[PDB]
Amino acid sequence: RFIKCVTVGDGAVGKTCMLISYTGPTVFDNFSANVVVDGSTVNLGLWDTAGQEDYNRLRPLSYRGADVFLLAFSLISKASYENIHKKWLPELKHYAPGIPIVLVGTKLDLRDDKQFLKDHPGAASITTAQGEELRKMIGAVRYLECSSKTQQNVKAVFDTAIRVALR
Amino acid sequence: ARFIKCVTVGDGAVGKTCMLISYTGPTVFDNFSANVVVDGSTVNLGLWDTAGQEDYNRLRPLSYRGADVFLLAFSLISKASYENIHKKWLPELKHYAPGIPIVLVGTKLDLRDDKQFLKDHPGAASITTAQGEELRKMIGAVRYLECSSKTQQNVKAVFDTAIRVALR
Amino acid sequence: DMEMMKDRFAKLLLGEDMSGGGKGVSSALALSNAITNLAASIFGEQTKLQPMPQDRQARWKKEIDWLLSVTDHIVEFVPSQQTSKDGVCTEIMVTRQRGDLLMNIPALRKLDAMLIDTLDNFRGHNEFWYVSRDSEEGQQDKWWLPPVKVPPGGLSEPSRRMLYFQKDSVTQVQKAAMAINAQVLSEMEIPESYIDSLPKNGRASLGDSIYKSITEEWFDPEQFLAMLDMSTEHKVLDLKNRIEASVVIWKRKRELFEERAETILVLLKQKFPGLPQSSLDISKIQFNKDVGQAVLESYSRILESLAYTVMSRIEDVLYTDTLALKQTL
Amino acid sequence: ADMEMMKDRFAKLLLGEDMSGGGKGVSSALALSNAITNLAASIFGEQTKLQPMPQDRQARWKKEIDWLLSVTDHIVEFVPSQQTSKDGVCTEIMVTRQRGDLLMNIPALRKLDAMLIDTLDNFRGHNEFWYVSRDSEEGQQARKWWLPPVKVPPGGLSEPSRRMLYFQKDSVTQVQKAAMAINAQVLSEMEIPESYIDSLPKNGRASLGDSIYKSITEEWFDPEQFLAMLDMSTEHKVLDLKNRIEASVVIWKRKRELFEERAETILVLLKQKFPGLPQSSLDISKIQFNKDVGQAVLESYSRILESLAYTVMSRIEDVLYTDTLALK
């Protein structure tokens, strides 16, 4: 068995940090390792999409033969939230309809940080309920909120991707 | 679209590695493969060294498998290396690769009629082309060439013929 | 410069498969991705129109050298002659860099250097500046980029002058790169898995009405396209893929329809110089085992997209200048 | 200096030996496996005397093998684990740790390596025995022709010298076994390639066959007498037997357990009775088609370490043999 898992979404969302977090100057090379799932072993292939948000022609392989997508937005950026439906969904639904999506909300440590939000008035916190609306809207298989700093739910994210890509 | 494995075998101090390095470029000869156009043909050539196997045989377990031609090498200045071609090596090839062509190469051609070298090296003793040719007919090699890594004389001819015989 | 290089090279021999099972990708695909990923990390920090900070520059210079350096060893093994001081001519085999690498790699290094050069022309003081995305002034498309600000009542004409000049310089760089990319892609082998995905014939791939248009008595590729819905970039993409699919089939009388289709392809390139890569392009890259072409394609690709980043970042200033002038006359 | 040489080496590896760069080369496993063997050959071809490795070559050897081995630092297991924050929050994470089979064997072998260089290093300084140019005058008095004749004093070696020589020979033969075991082990973990399985004859009898197969499957069994029943006078004949039996084992381990055990006890004696007998068809077939980088490095490194051991062993024995002659 072989799984291709691709992290997609805007810039400054933490795509690469999430992956560096999960596994281990922010550089994530294509990574592949054996993991056991409920009995037998699968080969997990993780793909970063960093830079695509800036120039689409940068990453031609992003969508090809993908088994599961992690759509990621920042919990402190409403623009990143809007783009999940305005920009990223039309792409995956063009190149790979019917491939499962896992909604990931990053920067969980910053969301209720009253101090940080005061310091960066432009940043704006997305609620869980708001992330669930977004899950049901883009037909994502599951919504999870995580943090690279903290590491909360990060494994839960990939555990979901792994499980869903073997359906 | 047709791959050739060309393994060169023989004793120590016969200069296999050298011949190989001279043909391509202590010194290493890494397994080297490259497209070579021979007689209008676009062949895929891969060259193997056997250095060190003359000492420990278990060192190079991939030496004979899938071979297409062999370069059997002896030093034109060592009679033992000439004797070992048929006493030691020919038995190995007759066993592990029945039916694949052998090209007999006599190395160190620059030294053979070197008056001063043979003088200051009493133990070295030159071998004649006739004597080399006798060995060829005896072990049943397809051709015999005398070459030299220092000058590159007939080195390129050694392999041209090897490839030509490897092919059918 | 040891423990740093070592890692990069070793991660590549695993072919992405860190289990060491060699269920990884080709050494070529591993190299294509390594380059892609490195450019994203370095270029991603270039959010402002200013020189690349000395250490990022150093990282870039040395890391890419490592990855590009495999091409130094990709050779043609050809017969030649040599002649000793003594007079003797002996035949030898000789080793020269492969045709498509000799000229193209240094061309791409020139392009690389041109772009780093162009960012360097903004060393020190510029008339435009950047603000924090999340400050007050920041709230006044790609939301992650620090909004650029420009002096009220425009930009000094000598400032606008150089902006336009570098943009042209960069745009010629972008085109240069795209040409090399397109060239590598045309010479990359058509994967066995693509031919298998192909429909039974032309009509099936083209669709009923498209097939009738390309097979009429007279054909005008200009009228043809005007007739079809080209409103979205996805649609042009679908057409290009359908036409491309045909051409592959047919190239296995029918030459008219075949020539007709290739006429459209060229027009598609001309009316849409910006299109994402076709199914075939993707497929070629996906399966390519030629490490030389792997390097040529991805290097040209990242350079195309660096060129674009700079074009993008210039165009911001200019658009911003324009708006501030339109706030008066 | 060590950028130009290093990058160079790793490049031709990425190229799978296919210097035309068209990727029609060889797996990364096999390229590395070859690189390890080729380098060793090159380094210990010249190390032809029982004396310390020329300090430069020793540094070459250390760094060069260091480069090829580094792939193994990155071959991992990706396993579920946990960590607790400085505040007592327990987070479930995923950890990387070196692959089992490498975590213990790579330092094991690196150790065997240093043990061999150390054995040569003990011969730093003056020795009672000396060496003579192969094609000189004193070398002409000497009955593997390429090794420079060894010479010992007229009355023969001291007891202390002859004693150290024995002590080293024991030490070195232990290393040869340690490596041989690591080699035999990794070989038994490597995938049996499809081509091999397409060469297998139909039945247990078909491989052996009729005569030998009866023997193995009889009511009683004695492995020594089984061999004494057979002509074992040449390597080829023993080797053809080992092939015959391994083919049958694969046939059986695929279908009976009694014969499977008896066969395995014969292969076991074959290791005792004829150590230093060539790799089998099955062994060679494994190495040929092995994609596993970890195992490629494991098998070749053990292999060359085993063979450097033999070399040093032979060096010692040439001294002890000519010592024998100098007394008699």
Which one is the CATH code of D1-190+290-328: 1.20.58.2010, 3.40.50.10240, 3.40.309.10, 2.40.30.160?
1.20.58.2010
Tokens coding A56: 């689409």
Size of interface C-D (CB pairs under 8 A): 120
Distance CA C254, CA C215 (A): 10
Residue B116, helix vs strand vs coil = helix
- Specify the length of chain C in residues: 329
Cβ neighbours of B19 in C, within 8 Å: none
Distance CA C311, CA C52 (A): 15
Residues 69-98 of D with CB under 8 A from A: 76-78, 80, 83, 85, 91-94, 96
Q: Which residue of C has its CA nearest to D190?
A: C21
Q: Which residues of D251-268 are buried (b: 16+ CB within 10 A; e: fewer)?
A: bbeeeeeebeebbeebee
Distance CA B65, CA D284 (A): 8
CB contact under 8 A, C69 and D19: no
Q: Which residues contact C15 (CB under 8 A, 6 or more apart)?
A: C22, C24, C25, C26, C27, C29, C30, D28
Tokens coding C152: 């009220």
Residue B19 in contact with residue B147, Cβ under 8 Å?
yes
Distance CA D119, CA D309 (A): 10
Distance CA D265, CA D271 (A): 10
Phi (first) and psi of residue D295, to 5 degrees: -75, -35
Q: Which residue of D has its CA nearest to A44?
A: D78
Distance CA D285, CA B129 (A): 40
Q: Select from B27, B59, B61 the Cβ nearest to the Cβ of D284.
A: B61
Residue B41, helix vs strand vs coil = strand
Residue C324 in contact with residue C159, Cβ under 8 Å?
no
Distance CA B23, CA B12 (A): 19
Residue D290 in contact with residue D34, Cβ under 8 Å?
no
Residue A107 among known ligand-binding residues: yes
Q: What is the CATH number of domain D191-289?
A: 1.20.58.1310
Angle between helices A15-23 and A154-164 (to 10 degrees): 90
Minimal Cα–Cα distance from D123 to chain C, Å? 33
Minimal Cα–Cα distance from D100 to chain C, Å? 11
Distance CA D131, CA D152 (A): 9
Distance CA C236, CA C240 (A): 6
Q: Which residues contact D191 (CB under 8 A, 6 or more apart)?
A: D286, D289, D290, D292
Residue C17 in contact with residue A32, Cβ under 8 Å?
yes
How many domains are there within chain A? 1
Distance CA C273, CA A49 (A): 23
Cβ neighbours of B156 in C, within 8 Å: 79, 90-93
Dihedral angle, C-alpha B145, B147, B153, B154, nearest 10 °? 30
Tokens coding C185: 């892609």
Distance CA B43, CA B35 (A): 6
Per-residue DSSP letter, B85: I
Q: Residue B137: which CATH number? A: 3.40.50.300
Closest CA to C68 of C327, C294, C328: C294
DSSP states of A27-93 as a string? ----EEEEEEETTEEEEEEEE--TTTTT-GGG-TTSSTT-SEEEEEEETT-HHHHHHIIIIIHHHHH
Closest CA to C230 of C283, C267, C201, C182: C267
What's the longest Cα–Cα distance across chain A? 49
Cβ neighbours of C27 in D, within 8 Å: 14-16, 23, 25, 28
Minimal Cα–Cα distance from D186 to chain A, Å? 20
Phi (first) and psi of residue A69, to 5 degrees: -110, 140
Distance CA C111, CA D24 (A): 30
B83 backbone φψ class: left, alpha, beta (φ>0; ψ -120 to 50): alpha
Cα-based distances in Å from B51 to B63, C156, D267, D307: 10, 73, 29, 13
Cβ neighbours of C75 in B, within 8 Å: 34
Sort B42 into a burial class: Cβ within 10 Å, 0-12 / 13-18 / 19+: exposed
Amino acid identity at A88:
W
Residue C179, helix vs strand vs coil = helix
Tokens 């999409």 sit at which residue? A49
CB contact under 8 A, C78 and B45: no
Beta bridge partners of A40: A37
Distance CA A8, CA A88 (A): 8
Distance CA A105, CA A116 (A): 17
Architecture of domain C1-188+288-329: Up-down Bundle (1.20)
Closest CA to D73 of C11, A103, B97, C30: C11
Minimal Cα–Cα distance from C10 to chain A, Å? 12
Minimal Cα–Cα distance from B150 to chain C, Å? 12
Sort D117 into a burial class: Cβ within 10 Å, 0-12 / 13-18 / 19+: middle
List chains touching D (3+ CB pairs under 8 A): A, B, C
Residue C91, helix vs strand vs coil = strand
Residue D120 in contact with residue D139, Cβ under 8 Å?
no
- Specify the length of chain A in residues: 167
Residue A50 among known ligand-binding residues: yes
Give resolution, Å, one decimal.
2.9
Which one is the CATH code of C189-287: 1.10.3330.10, 1.20.58.1310, 3.90.1150.10, 1.20.1250.20?
1.20.58.1310
- Specify the length of chain B in residues: 168
Distance CA D100, CA A109 (A): 36
Strand D76-84 and strand D130-131: the pairing is unpaired
Minimal Cα–Cα distance from B155 to chain C, Å? 8
Distance CA D207, CA D241 (A): 10
CB contact under 8 A, C22 and D14: no
Q: Which residues contact D51 (CB under 8 A, 6 or more apart)?
A: D120, D123, D124, D127
DSSP states of C30-78 as a string? HHHHHHHHHHHHHHHH--SSSPPPHHHHHHHHHHHHHHHGGGGG-EEEE
Cα-based distances in Å from C313 to C171, C214, C309, D56: 12, 42, 6, 54
In this structure, the number of other CB atoms found within 10 A of the CB of residue A11 comes to: 21
Residue B103 in contact with residue B141, Cβ under 8 Å?
yes
CB contact under 8 A, B123 and D12: no
Residues 264-283 of D with CB under 8 A from B: 276, 278-279, 283
Cβ neighbours of C43 in A, within 8 Å: 51, 54
Question: What is the extent of the structural domain holding B105?
Answer: 1-168
Q: Which residues of C275-294 are buried (b: 16+ CB within 10 A; e: fewer)?
A: bbbbbbbbbbbbbbbbbbbb
Distance CA B128, CA B117 (A): 16
Q: Does B have 3 or more CB contacts under 8 Å with D?
A: yes
Sort B98 into a burial class: Cβ within 10 Å, 0-12 / 13-18 / 19+: exposed
Strand A101-106 and strand A142-145: the pairing is parallel
CA-based torsion, D56, D61, D62, D67: positive or negative? positive
Beta bridge partners of A33: A44
Closest CA to D65 of D307, D299, D297: D297
Q: Which residue of C has its CA nearest to D18?
A: C74
Cβ neighbours of D22 in B, within 8 Å: 35
Question: Which residue numbers of B belong to the known binding site for GTP?
Answer: 10-17, 49-53, 107-110
CB contact under 8 A, C91 and B34: no
Chain B positions contacting chain C at CB under 8 Å are 23-25, 34-37, 45, 151-153, 155-157, 159
Task: Check CB contact of C305 with chain A, cutoff 8 Å.
Answer: yes
CB contact under 8 A, B33 and D20: yes
D209 preceded by a cis bond (ω within 30 of 0): yes
- Specify the length of chain D in residues: 328
Best of A4, A10, A32 to substitute, by most chain C Cβ atoms within 10 angstroms, is: A32
Q: Which residue of C has its CA nearest to A116?
A: C134
Q: Which residue of C has its CA nearest to D66?
A: C6
The sheet with strand A31-37 has its strands ordered as A31-37, A40-47, A2-9, A68-74, A101-106, A142-145
Residue A122 among known ligand-binding residues: no
Q: Which residues of B113-130 are buried (b: 16+ CB within 10 A; e: fewer)?
A: ebeebbeebebbebbeee
Closest CA to A81 of A120, A49, A127: A127
Task: List the helix and strand counts (H, then E) for chain A.
Answer: 6, 6
Strand A68-74 and strand B3-10: the pairing is unpaired
